[PDB]
Amino acid sequence: LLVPKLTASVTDGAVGVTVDAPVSVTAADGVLAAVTMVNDNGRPVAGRLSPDGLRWSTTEQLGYNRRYTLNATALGLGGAATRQLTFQTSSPAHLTMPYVMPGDGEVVGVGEPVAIRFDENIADRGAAEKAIKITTNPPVEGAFYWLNNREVRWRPEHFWKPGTAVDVAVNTYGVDLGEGMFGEDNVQTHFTIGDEVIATADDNTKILTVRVNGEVVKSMPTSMGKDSTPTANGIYIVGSRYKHIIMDSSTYGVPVNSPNGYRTDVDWATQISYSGVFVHSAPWSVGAQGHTNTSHGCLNVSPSNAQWFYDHVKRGDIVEVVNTVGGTLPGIDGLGDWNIPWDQWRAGNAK
Template identity: 45%
Template sequence: MSVVRSRCAPLALLLVVLAGCQSGVDGGQAAAPTTSSAPTPAAAQEVDAAVISIDPPLGSVDVDPVTPLRVFAGHGTLSAVAVTDDAGTPLAGALDPASATWTASTDLGYGTTYTVTATATDAAGRTTTSTGTVGTVSPRTLTMPTVFPNADNPVVGVGQPISITFDEDVTDRAAVERRLSVVTTPHVDGSWSWLSDRTVHYRPADFWPARTHVAVDADLYGVDVGGGVHGQASKHVEFDIGPKRVGVVDASELVLRLYVDDQLVQSMPTSLGKSSSPTPSGTYVVMQQSRRYTMDSSTYGVPIDAPAGYRTEVEYASRLSNSGIFVHAAPWSVGQQGSRNVSHGCLNVSTANAGWFYDNFGRGDVVQVAGAGPRLAETDGFGDWNVSWDEWLAGSALHPGV
């Protein structure tokens, strides 16, 4: 038997195969082609190693001591942080709930080198440790701010400015003002004004509203106030403004009228400074009070044995100025009180009236003198109210001339 070879056979075979692939059991739909392969092992997951960063960076020097020292962990968590000063004393601090950040809870010290050692752990349990130092600035000298009113004077009168004094010159006044805050209840607008390189005061445009609560923050620790001088400490004080107490006297009639919350409560004859030592006109603020006080002319340059000199003890002395103006008992001049000026500049009143003033007026209360001598200087005691509001604003380092 012979076999007939055909060039078409391969095509016929292909058609048969395709037909078989497309036919299903009982004439159903064709089944989809399937493939199979052996399973492959899962790829190994790569874990990033933990990274530690520190702010300020290790190796930093001359760091501001109020810069928050922080340690951060990336790709892991902090398992240990130790920060110690030159003496080995630990710096207090705490981790956040995620153990990703450690933050110092206290300010740094001046002129100190801190050693920082931190360990972080990654997801695979591997640890990373970083260690180094951070050094803080060493000031040329420090200056301590003193704030008045203070805890010893929780209630003052409506005329009391806030006073901050320094024991070193401040040459960067703006740097200081930016760190001073006054918050009042109710809200009262006011401004700082510099009286000298060591004194800055704060007051409203008008007297404080009676019964205002005042909170003062002088956040000056770590602040460079100029010339390498840094703030030694920060201060916080709170006080209240009492009732509005104002005394008014005009040199033309010599009667001191005293008002409480704008109601006249007392009138008393007085004698002001004679022509050779006139009482300055202007607004005074009671600075301090002494049950007994020795008046001494030598304190303002007149020797005791000079013709105009004196040294006399008086009762119920309420100081109104640095230059020595007081309301005080002067029984020797009762005959002239209300009719003639015979004092060395003080407001002379009777002993009974001086006692009343002593008992009912106090720190921060106001005495206004009109028609007498030249204007009281702004820098004499709390003479702050003797300049206009525009002049006051011009004394600020942050908004002069506003």
Template identity: 45%
Template sequence: MSVVRRRCAPFLLLVVLLAGCQNGVDGDPAPDAAATSAAPTTPPVPAAVVTADPPLGSVDVDPVAPLEVLADHGSLGVVRVTAADGTALPGGLDATGTTWTASADLDFGTTYTVTATAADAAGRTSTTTGTVATVTPRTFTMPTVFPNADTPVVGVGQPISITFDEDITDRAAVESHLSVVTTPHVDGSWSWLSDRTVHYRPADFWPAHTHVAVDVDTYGVDVGDGISGQAGKHVEFDIGPKKVGVVDATELVLRLYVDDQLVQTMPTSLGKDSTPTPSGTYVVMQQSRRYTMDSSTYGVPIDAPGGYRSEVEYASRLSNSGIFVHAAPWSVGQQGYRNVSHGCLNVSTANAGWFYENFGRGDVVEVSNAGATLAETDGFGDWNVSWDQWVAGSALHPGA
């Protein structure tokens, strides 16, 4: 009998052993690879954080700095900002719900309590409370603006005048908060006449019928020496027709033009040799139907040689130093021939009445070939300096 040798047994054993290894010890199935990796973890939701600008705890804060309350990692809910007396500061949230902004300026010397709630992405809420205290200045200064609501229409020569009731040591800080917008556009410049007074004018007279809007945004502005602006002002006015009077002291005829057309002539008498009328460009400052002329207002007692006190009609003031166009019936015989006044422009009563009725604040009178030039600071003598000199008086661009 023949014997058949089986040579496949070792191979089968190897397959069985390999299969056993793949199925695990003792024939158990192998664990899934995915099951052996670590399960992913969800990152924690950050808590909402409430901050403020200026930061909570701030003191000596500028009252015009816009107060904001902000939420990081969440959105704001109720925001309340109250002064010590319980007065709430108005404000509102932006479209994202992350920023609340005050809609009013803060008051000086006031501590505000800020209370704000915020919710994070998981819906958890928290409340933050803190304070912000504003500065208490040594004193305040209030601006006075001319033209104003009582002068809605002025002449082409009228400068804008702002006068403060305290000395301004930081002129640039003030000037940077002054704005003039004209329709149509007219370029101009501010120029400081003193520590309390700043004026604005164009290089030449205003164009007739210009609309002017002035903003004095000085509330809360530190003007130096511990002084802050007490309030802001907004003024609008219009420039009327171009009205200019012209007189030559060697001719003594006052010629009056409206929109460059001659409309009236008046014989006049200017200041005599001892009291000459200053030459230069004048601007009508104010008008009085009757006015008492008094030499003591410029240092000459009424009982001294050359002193006087008398009432005149139709007085149109041209300078602080007492130059007027006014009725002088006593000098009609000299008007047009000799200079006999104390410096004023003497005209007849009828002519003074015409000037009073037809010229007014901001209109111009130009005097030539008379005395020394009218000072820039005498009334509205602004036009008696060159444009370069005028611009040099600006605190923001001197010498430009």
């Protein structure tokens, strides 16, 4: 007859045990008769034993900077075996919390990237990407690209197909993200791609044309950026929308008392770049809309068309600006991700 054997997922005397996975104990040639795990001061850790008695596992989150002691006894026909193991978990220098966009259960447009923003700089971008699990249905190829030291984006080559489910599991708890920085917790979100909505502003006609699944539903006279402060050409992702908002130039880097500065309250404003480009109500330029450019870069439209845009365009929908005398919107604006060529995006920048 054989004496039972105990196998644990940790070793006695281990340090830096990562807390991104449960701790388990398994019995062979016998079953687990007693398993307890206790922290540095007596408190039991929640666990569960399998019905067949062969495997025990922790069932709650294990902590950073803990000294745990595991006691297990296996019994079989051939006798008994008991082991005691003590180990120490990861000791982070710092924690970082991820924040994910878009919201859980939201329906968004075909241009919405997966966004994960950490509240600290990430030293090991590769470890962060490896810890993020993206599921798509129908499955589509996508890739990670960093906009800055804190925020990474994931998207396909082309705009999402309507009806696509997207699941984002940010499994950063217990993960070393470089230089002693560990994930504060896991986060999760799930969203769905809705109708294809692409609004094109053509400087040659000064009309913003809204197409839904390829059909024109709206044609808005617009006044874009004057020659000296033009609207950049390119693909813009629709972000947040406001029934009214105070536009403060210092938010976007420019003092109000400055020459190019401003602080003005405007109605029905849909944001389309982090640099502060909005579609919004401009009752003062209705005469110019459809004829001449007069703005600081915004897409000025009529009050009723701005409210229409607010009501009918959603986060993740697309605005494309073409034929202006401006440059191209920066790929790393915040809402300019589609201006980065796919070969460059797919190659990534985790180094």
